[PDB]
Amino acid sequence: FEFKQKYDYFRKKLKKPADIPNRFEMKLHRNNIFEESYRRIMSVKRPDVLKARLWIEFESEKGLDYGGVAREWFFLLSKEMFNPYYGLFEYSATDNYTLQINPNSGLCNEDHLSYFTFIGRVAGLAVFHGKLLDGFFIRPFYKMMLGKQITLNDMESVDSEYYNSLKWILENDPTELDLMFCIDEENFGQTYQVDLKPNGSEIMVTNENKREYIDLVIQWRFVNRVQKQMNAFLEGFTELLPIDLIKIFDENELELLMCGLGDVDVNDWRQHSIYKNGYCPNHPVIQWFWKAVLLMDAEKRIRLLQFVTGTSRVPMNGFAELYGSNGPQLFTIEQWGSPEKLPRAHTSFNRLDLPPYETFEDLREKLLMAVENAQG
Amino acid sequence: ASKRIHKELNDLARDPPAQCSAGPVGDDMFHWQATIMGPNDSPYQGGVFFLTIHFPTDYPFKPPKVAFTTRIYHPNINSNGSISLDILRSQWSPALKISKVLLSICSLLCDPNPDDPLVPEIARIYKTDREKYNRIAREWTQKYAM
Amino acid sequence: MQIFVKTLTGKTITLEVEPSDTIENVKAKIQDKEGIPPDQQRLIFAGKQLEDGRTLSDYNIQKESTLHLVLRLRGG
Numbered sequence: 346f347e348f349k350q351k352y353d354y355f356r357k358k359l360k361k362p363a364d365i366p367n368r369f370e371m372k373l374h375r376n377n378i379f380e381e382s383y384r385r386i387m388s389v390k391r392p393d394v395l396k397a398r399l400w401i402e403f404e405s406e407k408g409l410d411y412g413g414v415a416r417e418w419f420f421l422l423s424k425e426m427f428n429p430y431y432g433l434f435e436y437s438a439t440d441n442y443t444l445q446i447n448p449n450s451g452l453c454n455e456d457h458l459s460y461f462t463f464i465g466r467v468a469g470l471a472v473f474h475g476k477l478l479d480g481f482f483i484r485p486f487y488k489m490m491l492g493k494q495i496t497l498n499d500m501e502s503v504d505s506e507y508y509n510s511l512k513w514i515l516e517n518d519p520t521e522l523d524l525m526f527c528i529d530e531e532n533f534g535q536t537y538q539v540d541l542k543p544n545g546s547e548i549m550v551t552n553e554n555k556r557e558y559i560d561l562v563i564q565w566r567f568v569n570r571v572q573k574q575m576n577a578f579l580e581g582f583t584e585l586l587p588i589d590l591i592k593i594f595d596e597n598e599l600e601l602l603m604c605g606l607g608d609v610d611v612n613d614w615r616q617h618s619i620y621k622n623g624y625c626p627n628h629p630v631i632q633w634f635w636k637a638v639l640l641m642d643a644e645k646r647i648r649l650l651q652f653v654t655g656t657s658r659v660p661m662n663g664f665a666e667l668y669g670s671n672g673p674q675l676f677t678i679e680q681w682g683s684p685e686k687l688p689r690a691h692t693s694f695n696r697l698d699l700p701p702y703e704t705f706e707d708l709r710e711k712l713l714m715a716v717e718n719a720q721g
Numbered sequence: 722a723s724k725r726i727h728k729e730l731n732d733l734a735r736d737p738p739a740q741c742s743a744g745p746v747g748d749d750m751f752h753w754q755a756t757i758m759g760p761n762d763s764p765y766q767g768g769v770f771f772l773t774i775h776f777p778t779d780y781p782f783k784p785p786k787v788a789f790t791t792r793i794y795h796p797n798i799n800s801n802g803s804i805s806l807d808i809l810r811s812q813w814s815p816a817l818k819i820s821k822v823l824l825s826i827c828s829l830l831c832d833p834n835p836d837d838p839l840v841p842e843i844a845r846i847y848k849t850d851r852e853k854y855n856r857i858a859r860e861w862t863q864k865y866a867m
Numbered sequence: 868m869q870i871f872v873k874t875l876t877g878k879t880i881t882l883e884v885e886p887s888d889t890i891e892n893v894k895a896k897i898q899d900k901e902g903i904p905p906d907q908q909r910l911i912f913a914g915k916q917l918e919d920g921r922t923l924s925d926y927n928i929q930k931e932s933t934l935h936l937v938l939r940l941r942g943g
Contacts, residue, residue, distance in 0.1 A: 797943055805942065805943040806943070807943065811941075834943055836906060837942055837943030838942070838943065839942070839943065
């Protein structure tokens with residue numbers, strides 16, 4: 346209810362100006378969508394015109410819809426903007442698939458700022474027209490839009506083990522860990538040390554500055570090296586919508602508002618899964634598993650994925666490109682235990698130890714349980 | 722990160738961890754290698770296993786990656802040598818010293834954890850047919866650990 | 868004596884116990900109302916991990932004490 350309530354009130358406050366075309370004229374080649382889309386959207390001088398209906402046609406797929414090519418144009422341009430290899434955004438981790446601004450975006454695309462506002466122009470444009478962008482960001486991103494402050498707490502969704510280690514520094518004496526006010530970076534197999542503050546390389550994390558240290562570490566991890574960018578993204582995002590008209594939503598709501606839910610494509614999933622120690626594609630238990638998945642709804646599915654892989658998200662190129670601690674690792678299902686035991690998982694190898702269940706509902710009950718009553 | 726590693730290194734030099742030695746090879750200070758001797762009167766008796774210890778640039782906020790290079794027949798250690806130890810993932814703490822992670826691995830060798838296994842087939846054996854597990858595990862020590 | 872065992876879903880399992888019962892048994896009972904083997908259970912009581920080698924009166928778990936059913940499920 347609460348979310349539904351809010352959304353609607355949100356939709357209405359928005360207003361279509363009266364001195365703009367009936368629709369927005371767009372026709373471009375699917376194989377060069379980014380640059381072309383970029384030039385079009387980024388030339389309009391009456392940014393308001395962009396509030397007109399999406400009228401799109403590609404000189405490739407001459408599908409006479411021109412309504413539905415709007416749902417696609419977003420799903421297609423996203424795969425471009427939020428591609429970890431274009432250089433504008435990257436993955437928070439090798440196995441997290443949640444995007445974040447590349448601090449070194451400037452040293453990749455030479456005038457990247459114009460591009461961020463563009464991604465912003467679009468980004469918001471999609472919210473105005475009730476569409477969704479593809480891919481998700483680390484909480485801090487959303488929090489930056491909302492005008493929230495970033496803190497130690499915010500890096501637990503991004504990197505738990507790091508969070509905890511920092512939180513330890515916070516509740517103990519760190520003099521023995523012999524830390525210095527600096528970090529370590531890598532590029533071309535070379536590890537180079539960077540200072541958090543002037544001469545940090547030479548300063549110890551005592552028990553008097555341990556707070557100020559956890560500050561710089563977080564400041565640097567999610568804020569220092571991207572404010573110019575994150576700001577451009579907003580310049581554009583708000584050329585379509587009033588930034589404060591959105592503060593009514595929260596971190597998770599705003600997320601669901603522009604990046605929807607992450608409903609997992611069940612097919613691409615089943616197809617890129619491997620079975621070990623007994624199980625195989627046509628095995629009885631396996632046959633049920635998937636029929637159990639078929640039944641679950643968006644939430645329960647994403648959870649199931651989170652319980653087994655440790656991330657509720659999925660790579661850009663699907664389940665074929667899944668990663669584990671040590672690299673590429675397809676979803677795995679291995680036979681283990683007696684029917685008594687609940688199913689287990691090792692988020693490091695994206696594996697699921699599934700005890701050989703005797704009946705379908707027998708499996709469904711123990712699975713749906715592990716999934717829900719989980720993450721602790 | 723740097724100072725943290727050296728210091729911890731000399732701390733091994735001064736009073737080392739019994740049954741296990743570990744230090745960097747080559748110049749790199751982020752890539753060590755360790756040796757652990759099969760706990761006495763365990764099926765790994767007589768053997769000597771080799772391990773790699775890669776320290777991430779996020780140390781010690783993130784745990785070091787530790788793996789067995791020498792084939793070993795155990796319930797929580799697979800063919801790649803991936804070790805299913807808790808203080809290596811969910812339980813790591815910036816305070817922990819290598820000596821203590823190495824020693825923890827010795828522990829796991831003489832007294833497995835067959836209920837939170839990494840290798841299912843082996844777990845069931847060490848649970849139902851113990852002397853089997855011992856016979857097998859011992860033979861692997863002859864082929865790969867010697 | 869009556870207590871509560873809250874699962875991570877918001878649900879709760881009210882059971883019937885006596886102050887001398889060993890935590891190892893609070894699970895045997897939750898194991899019939901939920902069917903969850905004890906070795907995959909963890910009852911967290913106000914930030915502390917209650918042992919199966921103790922009793923309800925050792926941690927002052929009294930009438931209406933709300934423990935927590937934590938599923939110990941990710942592997943080793």
